[PDB]
Amino acid sequence: MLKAWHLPVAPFIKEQQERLMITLWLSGDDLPPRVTLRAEEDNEELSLPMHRLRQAPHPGVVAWRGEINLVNGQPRRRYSFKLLWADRQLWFTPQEFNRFPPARLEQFAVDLPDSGPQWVADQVFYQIFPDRFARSQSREAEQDATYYHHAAGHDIVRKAWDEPLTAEAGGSTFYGGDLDGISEKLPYLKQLGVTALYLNPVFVAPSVHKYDTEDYRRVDPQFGGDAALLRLRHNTQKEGMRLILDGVFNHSGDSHAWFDRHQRGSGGACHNADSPWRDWYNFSPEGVAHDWLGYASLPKLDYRSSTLIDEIYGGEDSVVRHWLKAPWSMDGWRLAVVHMLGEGGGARNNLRHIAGITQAAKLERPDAFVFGEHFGDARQWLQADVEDSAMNYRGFTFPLWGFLANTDISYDPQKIDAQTCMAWMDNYRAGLSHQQQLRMFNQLDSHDTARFKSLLGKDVARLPLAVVWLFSWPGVPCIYYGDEVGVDGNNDPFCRKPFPWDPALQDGDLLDLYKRMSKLRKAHQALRYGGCQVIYAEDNVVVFVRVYKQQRVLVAINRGEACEVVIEDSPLLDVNGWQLKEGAGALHDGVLTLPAISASVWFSR
Amino acid sequence: MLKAWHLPVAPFIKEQQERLMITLWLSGDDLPPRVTLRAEEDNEELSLPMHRLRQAPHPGVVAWRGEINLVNGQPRRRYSFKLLWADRQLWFTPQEFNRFPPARLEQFAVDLPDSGPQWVADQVFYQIFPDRFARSQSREAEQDATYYHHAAGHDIVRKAWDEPLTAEAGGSTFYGGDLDGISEKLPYLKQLGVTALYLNPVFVAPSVHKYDTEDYRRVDPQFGGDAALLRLRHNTQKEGMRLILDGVFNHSGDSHAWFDRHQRGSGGACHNADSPWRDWYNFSPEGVAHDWLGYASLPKLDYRSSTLIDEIYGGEDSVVRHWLKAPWSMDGWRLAVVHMLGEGGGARNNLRHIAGITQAAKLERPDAFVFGEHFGDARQWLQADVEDSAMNYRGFTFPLWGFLANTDISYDPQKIDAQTCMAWMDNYRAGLSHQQQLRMFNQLDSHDTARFKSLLGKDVARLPLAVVWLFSWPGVPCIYYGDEVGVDGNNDPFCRKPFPWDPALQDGDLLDLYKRMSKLRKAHQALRYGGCQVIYAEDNVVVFVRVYKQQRVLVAINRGEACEVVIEDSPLLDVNGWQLKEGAGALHDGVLTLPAISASVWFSR
Ligand SMILES: C[C@H]1O[C@H](O[C@H]2[C@H](O)[C@@H](O)[C@@H](O)O[C@@H]2CO)[C@H](O)[C@@H](O)[C@H]1N[C@H]1C=C(CO)[C@@H](O)[C@H](O)[C@H]1O
Ligand SMILES: C[C@H]1O[C@H](O[C@H]2[C@H](O)[C@@H](O)[C@@H](O)O[C@@H]2CO)[C@H](O)[C@@H](O)[C@H]1N[C@H]1C=C(CO)[C@@H](O)[C@H](O)[C@H]1O
């Protein structure tokens, strides 16, 4: 019966003289005579009175306003609305109306003052698995050589760029991409709209993926060494691009001097009880060192050790800070396996240690961006503010895998409609403040998944829909290298093909779409800072609007046959008019005419 | 269509040779050909296969079984069930079926090994506001005297036991109850079924409630001093009773030597910049010391200070440990204002400090029980395991206030039916492991609320329903002193009447009900350890079953007119028969015949 609107952004909120003004919109025939702003100060629940505004913001809509005092309390301002009649109450939340009180951690929330990395919302990221992206022209003879991969039991193998990928020696096959290759491709990346790089590991390590860290203080010479990473840092700085390295601190590689399984230097932890780093690893009674999910090449680090803590993040000279200060001056860290890191061979005290890693990073570099790898549900980590963001597999990737590709994290069959997809995406982000939502690291696939283009199988025509959605859902988008020219393949090792630089092997129409979406995101504040209201979500169609001050961006996605959808009048959609910017959809008199398998974007004028 | 059953208790779980066996029950015509046990190890999501059991546990029910490996991982074992068909999936959770994956922190969960205070589940608590419970026979002439309450601006006032309570000098009126009075009433309390006491503050402080702590190391002489608390500790130990003190560590009183607002000893923080405890408090620019919600008598403690940390919980001699070791040997702490405690004048770093307080307590006393005062949503605190339990206002008290008394935390009108009430209670506890659920500190009212009997107003006939429910919902029940003989009154100050020892002023039928419910809880393992499945929840009727091994306890509550309710066949209810233990309800051939305004309890035979 009753209708309500609120988003944690202007025009609904406004900061004014140490006060956060909060406005709620209501419409209906049985309007509550009172409305309480339920807010919070230092975790104490507050009942703040709201007053009816004289001016109707839109026809048939009543506005209520309250104020959060900003001089006291913690920066994250949580709130919801308690509608009050003579005999009853009803809550309005990020997940519509609730008959019983919402969870404290599923309210609306705004971070004021926001101390997070505010530049993230303005970025378009691009993830590069360096061995497979680009070989520098002044390439490597000594770094196209071979050596013995102890953990693998044999020599690494070299392959030419057009040699097909095989399941054989997946961690030991090198196509020879390097960091100067990335530098040389910055014009391509700038042309794509990319403003920021996330690199898979680049420190000294024997494998091709290099999560088996051997030296945390040196860049692998295979990728061009320290010199080539200094050049990449310079070249991205010159082009105004951000640069994030992969930080692998849950475990080291078993060839690291601290562990030294293959006794390259008398042995650290594995074959020495008096080793200096003996207590940096955990050894069972049964003789198996604790490792990452049973991979002996990845011995887990024991953060009970106060010397290890100092080495990774506690000290001024710690690894986390080393790469964030000059000459390196990286922009932050992607935290590999952020969720298992801890003490005693497991995740004991994990949240404290992640909080310490992030704190150490911001100490060296206040605007550093620290986000964690979360295949699972990151909400406990983000709700405790131990990191800025997560790889948003649960809140973005897997909803799209189910709705568009009928599959999921385990490649189990999925059958979810638009209702369920959007309930899923909105439930997840209800756990996050607006500022957190805007910096969630969103991607369609990664070096640890099958390529989304392949997951679509016979429904590959849906791929452009996911691209539009990637650039218009709250979060910072990350392109996985090659996705934009149509690279496909199954999961690891097959998701890491060498990038096809031959334009004959490139999907140019897909490339152009990525370019156009990056321009729209760069152009429109609501696509970077806006709130997000799902307007319509039924069967094959999702419609949502991004909202920022007076601006609106309407997005309509239709995964199935051509159809028409009626959009009820909404005060969020009450604009002078709409300009179609991308896609073939059409809007007229509240009727969306949506072609089959299409995504469309309108800007309000 | 499909039906599913699972509770985190036998017969559904069983520990066997470092393995947790997990069984799921399914029934229906379109049963999934595969079921995945979604589990977790060191926060990594696991896909464990389940196999169909040959033996049907009950007619028409299929059983699936999986195993969690217990040798690795953290003690809290989280899991849910992923039902798999050829084209689709469906999740089974504590909140029934979900079409998208449940939250990590809303799964089933079992703590194995359980390091919490396992004795709590066996208790019946009784909360005593000491000034208002009982005056010792060898009473106090010097402690029936008067003195100057600086923070109040006048002398404390003394009142005779039958003098009515008034809003005047609510914090400064003393009826003279003391600790030896409690000792002398232990036979009454043992007769009631009480096995454990929670005392409001008893340390030296000028007010009657004594949350304005002046000396953390001494018992107030008004209550009989250190000697009388030693006697109470002895007498409860003799009677096999547990004893919990109120720990007020978010703030001190402003008369404490550390603060010393009234310069009783040259002044600590308030009137001295070189004070030893200057940095134990926070002073604004504007001249107002930071305090508890604007009460100058309660200056907030600044846990940034490393000396304060050592004094409260860090040191061997710290306040938290002092009262847990001999000669005091208390059984734990109720943490006042647990949610605001922190650094800098607010809740900054709250979770770390509460975790430290609990850790210090368990260091002194491994089975200590630490639970926090949570008027609001305690789930973030409990999900991070920073305390054992909470005063369960959000999960128990306020659901009953709405469903039975049409009101809520703010005394705002509520209109919720059985559906909403039970959705509320089950949603809250879905955030908690079974072991956490069993030790949630449940009560109908407190020294900080109106008496539930008064809140019921014209619906006071519903009071016995709340009593039955208090003893049969998962959690440890706490009787608020006088509730059991029918004491009423509005909120603070009027909720703290002197206990009516004259039997003419006592509701004896209500007393007897409390006695009988305590006997049933003591008698039946499912009322102390059992899982809990809501069987029926519509309009005025709530039916739930507690489940433990082969035993069942069925509870049916009807807040309205007499009615009949059909209970569908349930494999949880498939027993040899039912013995009615309390109430006038009747069960026959799946038909519950429930009198008006009634609660009934059956034991399976
Ligand atoms: C062993 C494992 O090592 C890396 O996996 C890492 C992830 O890529 C990364 O995102 C990080 O957060 O944590 C992981 C551990 O450090 C390699 O990239 C992976 O290729 C993986 N290699 C294994 C891959 C398997 C199946 O993909 C496995 O069966 C192979 O033996 C290994 O090569
Ligand atoms: C000022 C305040 O002090 C105590 O309140 C405490 C709670 O009882 C207790 O549960 C704890 O966790 O935290 C509170 C602060 O320490 C007294 O018990 C209360 O009576 C309260 N006294 C005030 C009561 C008010 C309304 O009830 C207030 O308007 C009076 O001036 C005060 O007496």
Where do the domains of chain A lie, and which CATH numbers do they carry?
A: 3-111 (2.60.40.10), 120-526 (3.20.20.80), 529-604 (2.60.40.1180)
CA separation for the pair B463, B461 (Å, rounded): 6
The residue in chain A having the minimum alpha-carbon distance to the alpha carbon of residue B431 is A103
Closest CA to B84 of B24, B44, B40, B41: B24
Whether the CB-CB separation of B381 and B351 falls below 8 Å is answered with yes
Q: Are strands A62-69 and B108-111 parallel, antiparallel or unpaired?
A: unpaired
Ligand closest to CA A336: 1
What is the residue-wise DSSP string for A412-434? ------HHHHHHHHHHHHTTS-H
Query: B129, B173, B211: which to mutate for ligand 2, most atoms within 8 A of CB?
Result: B211
The two three-digit tokens of residue A23, written as one number: 């406005």
Which token pair is B284? 């604004």
Residues 6+ apart with CB under 8 A from B321: B313, B315, B360, B361, B363, B364
Strand, coil or helix: B151: helix
Q: Which long-range contacts (CB under 8 A, 24 or more apart) does B199-202 make?
A: B199/B127, B199/B128, B199/B130, B199/B243, B199/B244, B199/B245, B199/B246, B200/B127, B200/B128, B200/B129, B200/B130, B200/B246, B200/B447, B201/B245, B201/B246, B201/B248, B201/B336, B202/B130, B202/B229, B202/B245, B202/B246
Residue A21 to residue A516: CA distance in whole angstroms: 36
d(CA B149, CA B330): 29
Strands (E), A510-574: 531-538, 541-548, 551-558, 563-566
Q: Is B346 in the pocket of ligand 2 (CB under 6 A)?
A: no
C-alpha A568: how far from chain center: 32
Tokens in use for B253? 């009183």
Contact B133, B199 (CB under 8 A): no
Please work out whether the CB of residue A373 comes within 6 Å of at least one atom of ligand 1: yes
SS3 B344: coil
Give alpha helix (H) positions in B456-603.
Answer: 463-470, 508-523, 526-529
Residue A107 DSSP code: S
Q: If you count them, how many residues does chain B have?
A: 605
Task: Determine the length of chain A.
Answer: 605
Chain A partners within 8 Å of B105 (Cβ): 377, 379-380
- Alpha carbons B393 and B338: distance in angstroms, whole number: 14
By Cβ distance, the residue of A345, A377, A416 closest to B103 is A377
Nearest atom of ligand 2 to the alpha carbon of B295 = 1
Amino acid letter, B156: I
CB within 8 A of B288, min separation 6: which ones?
none
> Whole-angstrom Cα distance, residue B378 to residue B387?
10
A546: three-class secondary structure by DSSP:
strand
**Which residue among A492, A494, A496 has the greatest number of ligand 1 atoms within 8 angstroms of its CB, and so is best to mutate?**
A492
Is the separation of the CB atoms in B330 and B202 below 8 Å? no
User: Which technique was the structure solved with, according to the deposited record?
Assistant: X-ray
Question: Are the beta carbons of A410 and B42 separated by less than 8 Å?
Answer: no
Q: Is the dihedral of CA B499, B501, B506, B508 positive or negative?
A: positive
DSSP-derived secondary structure letter, B2: -
How far does chain A reach from its first CA to its final CA, in angstroms? Answer: 31
Both tokens of residue B361? 């307590």
Token pair 């102390």 is found at B528
Residue nearest (by alpha carbon) to ligand 2 atom 14: B211
Is A448 near ligand 1, meaning CB less than 6 Å away?
yes
Question: Ligand 2 within 6 A of B211 CB?
Answer: yes
Under a CB-based contact definition with an 8 Å cutoff, are residues B184 and B175 in contact?
A: no
For A73, the closest of B293, B346, B420 (CB atoms) is B346
Nearest CA to ligand 2 atom 22: B171
Q: How far is CA B416 from the centre of its chain?
A: 23
Question: Token pair for residue B471?
Answer: 């003893």
DSSP A258: T
**Residues of chain A contacting B44 with CB distance shorter than 8 Å:** 293, 339-340, 376
Q: With contacts defined as CB-CB under 8 Å, which chain A residues touch B45?
A: 375-376, 409
Task: For residue B539, give the amino acid letter.
Answer: D
Q: Are the Cβ atoms of A43 and B82 closer than 8 angstroms?
A: no
First-last CA distance in chain B: 31
Task: Yes or no: say if B105 and A378 are a contact pair by the CB < 8 Å rule.
Answer: no
CA distance B144 to chain A (A): 37
Q: What is the C-alpha R_g of chain A? A: 25
Contacts of B204 (CB under 8 A, 6+ apart): B210, B213, B214, B215, B218, B219, B220, B221
- Structure tokens, A191: 């042309």
Burial track A539-558 (b if 16+ CB lie within 10 A, e otherwise): ebbbbbbbbbeebbbbbbbb
State the burial class of residue A76 (Cβ atoms within 10 Å of its Cβ: 0-12, 13-18, 19+). Answer: middle
Residue A85 CB contacts under 8 Å (≥ 6 apart), including other chains: A30, A32, A33, B413
Which ligand is nearest the CA of B293, by number?
2
Contacts 24+ apart (CB under 8 A), B148-155: B149/B206, B149/B207, B150/B206, B150/B255, B150/B261, B150/B262, B151/B206, B151/B207, B151/B212, B151/B253, B151/B254, B151/B255, B151/B261, B151/B262, B151/B296, B151/B297, B152/B206, B152/B207
Question: What is the token pair recorded at B362?
Answer: 């368990």
Output the CA B383–ligand 2 centroid distance in Å: 28
Which stretch of DSSP H or E encloses residue A196?
strand A196-199
Contacts of B377 in chain A (CB under 8 A): 101, 103-105
- Alpha-carbon distance of B60 to A191, in angstroms, equals 63
Distance of CA B228 to the CA centre of its chain: 27
Residue A449: alpha-carbon gap to chain centroid = 15
B34-38 — which CB contacts under 8 Å span 24+ positions?
A: B34/B84, B35/B64, B35/B81, B35/B82, B35/B83, B35/B84, B36/A410, B36/A412, B36/B81, B36/B82, B36/B84, B37/B66, B37/B67, B37/B68, B37/B79, B37/B81, B37/B82, B38/B79, B38/B80, B38/B81, B38/B82, B38/B91, B38/B101, B38/B107
Residues of A in contact with B88 (CB under 8 A): 413-415
CB contact under 8 A, B84 and A416: no
Give the separation between CA A312 and CA B471, rounded to whole angstroms: 51
Residue A248, token pair as written in the block: 């692998």
Question: Parallel, antiparallel, or unpaired: how do β-strands B578-582 and B586-588 relate?
Answer: unpaired
Q: Phi-psi category of A366—alpha, beta or left, where left has phi over 0 and alpha has psi -120 to 50?
A: alpha
Amino acid at B431: G
Tokens of A287: 């003789």
**Helix intervals (H) in A365-397:** 379-383
> How many beta carbons lie within 10 A of that of residue A572, not counting itself?
18
* Dihedral sign of CA atoms B559, B563, B567, B568 in order: negative
Contact A179, A228 (CB under 8 A): yes
Inter-chain touch B410–A342, beta carbons under 8 Å: no
B546 lines ligand 2 (CB under 6 A): no
Residue B190 token pair: 């043992």
The closest ligand to the CA of B167 turns out to be 2
- The alpha carbon of A362 is separated from its chain's Cα centroid by a whole number of angstroms, namely 19
**CA distance linking residue A277 with residue A280, whole number of Å:** 5
Q: Resolution of the experimental model in angstroms, please? A: 1.9
Pairing state of beta strands B148-149 and A108-111? unpaired
CA A469 – CA A460 distance, rounded (Å): 15
Contact A100 B379 (CB under 8 A): no
Joined together, the tokens standing for residue A407 give 């599959």
Distances (CA, A) of B148 to A301, A543, B129, B157, B415: 60, 68, 22, 10, 47
- The CA distance from A50 to B546, in Å, is 43
Check if the beta carbon of residue B393 is closer than 8 Å to that of residue B364.
no
Q: Is A122 in the pocket of ligand 1 (CB under 6 A)?
A: no
